[PDB]
Amino acid sequence: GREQWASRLGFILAAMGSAVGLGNIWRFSYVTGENGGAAFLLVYLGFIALIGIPIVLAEFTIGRRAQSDAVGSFEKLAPGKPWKVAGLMGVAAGFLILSFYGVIAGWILFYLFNYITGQLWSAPAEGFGGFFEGFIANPTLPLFWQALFMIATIWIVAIGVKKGIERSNKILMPLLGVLLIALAIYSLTLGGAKEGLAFLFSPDWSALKDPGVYLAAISQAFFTLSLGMGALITYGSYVSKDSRLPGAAVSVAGLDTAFAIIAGIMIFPAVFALGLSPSGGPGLVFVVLPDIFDSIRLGPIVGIAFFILLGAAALSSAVSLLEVPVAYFMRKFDWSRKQAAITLGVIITLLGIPSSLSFGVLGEVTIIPGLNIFDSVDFIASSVFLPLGGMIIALFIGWGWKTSDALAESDLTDSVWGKLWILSLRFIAPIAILIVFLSAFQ
Ligand SMILES: CCCCCCCCCCCCO[C@@H]1O[C@H](CO)[C@@H](O[C@H]2O[C@H](CO)[C@@H](O)[C@H](O)[C@H]2O)[C@H](O)[C@H]1O
Ligand SMILES: CCCCCCCCCO[C@@H]1O[C@H](CO)[C@@H](O)[C@H](O)[C@H]1O
Ligand SMILES: CCCCCCCCCO[C@@H]1O[C@H](CO)[C@@H](O)[C@H](O)[C@H]1O
Ligand SMILES: N[C@@H](Cc1ccc(O)cc1)C(=O)O
Numbered sequence: 001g002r003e004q005w006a007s008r009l010g011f012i013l014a015a016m017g018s019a020v021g022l023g024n025i026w027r028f029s030y031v032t033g034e035n036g037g038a039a040f041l042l043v044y045l046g047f048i049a050l051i052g053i054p055i056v057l058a059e060f061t062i063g064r065r066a067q068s069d070a071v072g073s074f075e076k077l078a079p080g081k082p083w084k085v086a087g088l089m090g091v092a093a094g095f096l097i098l099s100f101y102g103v104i105a106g107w108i109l110f111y112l113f114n115y116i117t118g119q120l121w122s123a124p125a126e127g128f129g130g131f132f133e134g135f136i137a138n139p140t141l142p143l144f145w146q147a148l149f150m151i152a153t154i155w156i157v158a159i160g161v162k163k164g165i166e167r168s169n170k171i172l173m174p175l176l177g178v179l180l181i182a183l184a185i186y187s188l189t190l191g192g193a194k195e196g197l198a199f200l201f202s203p204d205w206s207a208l209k210d211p212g213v214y215l216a217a218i219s220q221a222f223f224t225l226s227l228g229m230g231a232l233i234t235y236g237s238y239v240s241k242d243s244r245l246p247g248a249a250v251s252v253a254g255l256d257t258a259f260a261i262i263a264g265i266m267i268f269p270a271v272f273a274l275g276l277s278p279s280g281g282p283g284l285v286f287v288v289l290p291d292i293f294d295s296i297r298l299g300p301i302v303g304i305a306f307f308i309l310l311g312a313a314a315l316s317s318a319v320s321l322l323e324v325p326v327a328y329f330m331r332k333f334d335w336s337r338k339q340a341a342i343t344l345g346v347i348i349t350l351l352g353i354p355s356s357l358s359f360g361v362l363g364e365v366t367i368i369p370g371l372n373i374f375d376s377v378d379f380i381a382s383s384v385f386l387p388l389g390g391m392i393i394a395l396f397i398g399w400g401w402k403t404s405d406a407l408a409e410s411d412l413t414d415s416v417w418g419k420l421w422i423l424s425l426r427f428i429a430p431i432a433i434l435i436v437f438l439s440a441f442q
C-alpha cells in the first residue's frame with residue numbers, strides 16, 4: 001500500500017512546496033544579515049550550484065529507486081551497510097528542525113491574527129520592535145499559535161500523500177512570489193536602497209576570513225533546499241518512473257533561490273531605510289516588515305495577504321518535515337499514518353516548547369556553549385546533521401553505487417552533465433563539506 005502522487009505535476013510542486021518556506025524569507029534574511037551579506041551570499045549561491053543541486057538530485061534518485069522511507073531506502077539499496085546513518089540522522093533532524101519551525105510559524109499566525117482583527121493598523125505605542133519582543137517573551141502566547149500551526153501540520157500529514165500533501169493550493173506560492181516582487185519593488189523606493197543593495201551584492205571579502213561564514217552559508221543552503229535529511233528521498237519515493245529528476249532538482253533549486261534573492265531585495269533596503277542593524281537576529285523580518293507595511297495606505301491589507309501567503313508556504317514545508325518521521329514510523333512499527341502523524345506531531349510540538357521559551361524566560365540557558373536552546377537546536381540540525389547527512393548521501397552514490405546505475409536511475413547519460421554530477425558526489429561536494437567542518441571546528 002505504498003502511496004504515490006496522483007498527479008503528474010504532484011511530485012515537483014510538492015518538492016517546490018517543501019523547499020520554499022520560512023527559510024527563504026525569515027532564515028535567509030537574518031543569517032545573511034549577521035554573516036555580512038554579499039560575500040556570504042556568493043558563497044551561499046556557490047553552495048547551491050555545486051552542492052545543493054547534485055545532492056538534491058541524489059535524494060530524488062535514492063527515493064525513487066527504493067520506494068521507501070529515508071531510512072528504508074538505505075536498508076534496501078545496500079543491505080547491512082553503514083550508509084543508513086544518514087537516514088537515521090535525517091529522521092532525528094526532522095524532530096529537531098520542525099520543533100522550532102513550528103514556533104516561527106506560530107509567530108506567523110499570531111501576526112496574521114493581529115492584522116485580521118485590526119490590532120496592527122497602526123504602529124503600537126511601544127513600537128514594532130517592542131511589540132515583537134513583548135509577544136515572543138510571553139511564556140504561553142507563542143505556544144498557542146505554535147500548537148495551532150502544528151495541528152494543521154499533523155492534519156495534512158495524517159490525511160495522506162494523495163489527499164493531503166498533494167492537494168495544497170497551486171495559486172498560493174505563485175501569489176507569494178508576486179507579492180514579494182511587488183514588495184521588493186516598493187522597498188527599493190524607500191531611501192535605503194543604495195546602502196541596502198551594496199550590502200547584499202557588493203562583497204566585503206574581509207568577512208570570508210572567518211570560517212564560520214562558510215559554515216553558515218552551507219547550513220542555509222542545506223536548510224533552504226530541505227536537503228541532507230532524506231526529505232527529498234521521501235518525496236521522491238512517491239513518484240514513479242514517469243518523471244525527469246534532473247530538471248526537477250534545478251527547478252526546485254532555481255525557484256528557491258529566486259525567492260531568497262527577492263526576499264533580500266525587500267528586506268535589506270527596508271532595513272537601511274529604517275536605520276536598523278542588518279544583524280538584529282531571528283525577529284528581523286517581524287520588526288522590519290510591519291513597519292514597512294505601516295508606511296503604505298493599504299498596508300494592513302498587505303500584511304494580511306503577506307502572512308497568509310507566508311503561513312501557507314511554511315505549512316507545506318512543515319508537512320514535508322513531519323513526513324520524514326511519519327513514513328519511517330509507519331514502516332518500522334506498523335503505525336498507521338494518522339497514529340504516527342498525531343503521535344510524532346504532538347511529541348515534536350513538545351520538543352519545540354523549550355525553544356519557544358528560549359526567546360524569553362529561558363533566554364539565559366545554554367546547551368551548546370554560547371548558544372541558547374533555540375540557537376543550539378538549530379545549530380546541531382542545520383550546521384551538523386544536514387551537512388553531514390548530505391556528505392554521506394553524496395558519498396553513497398559516489399562510492400557505493402556503480403556509475404551506470406547512478407546515471408540510469410537519475411535519468412542521466414555519461415554526458416558532460418552526467419560526468420559533472422558523479423564528480424560532484426565523489427569529490428567536490430563531500431570534500432567541500434569536510435573542509436568546511438575542519439576549518440570551522442578548530
Ligand atoms: C488565524 C487562526 C485563527 C484561530 C482563532 C484564534 C481565536 C482565539 C484568540 C486567542 C488569542 C487571543 O489571546 C489574547 O491575544 C492578545 C494578543 O493578541 C494577548 O495580549 C497580550 O499579549 C500581547 C503580545 O505582545 C501584548 O501586546 C498585550 O499587551 C497582552 O495583553 C492576550 O493576552 C491573549 O490572551
Ligand atoms: C507590481 C507593482 C509594484 C508597484 C510598486 C510601486 C510602489 C512605489 C511607491 O513609491 C512611493 O509613492 C510615491 C511614488 O509614486 C513616492 O513619492 C514615495 O516616496 C514612495 O514611497
Ligand atoms: C535590483 C537588483 C540590482 C542589484 C545591483 C546592486 C549593486 C550593489 C553595488 O552597489 C554599488 O557599490 C558601489 C561601491 O561598491 C557604489 O559606488 C555604487 O554607488 C553602488 O551602487
Ligand atoms: N527548506 C525549508 C525548511 C525545511 C528544511 C528541511 C526539511 O526537511 C523540510 C523543510 C525552508 O527553507 O523553509
Ligand code: NA
Binds near residue numbers: 018020021023225
Ligand atoms: Na527554502
Ligand code: NA
Binds near residue numbers: 018019313
Ligand atoms: Na513550503
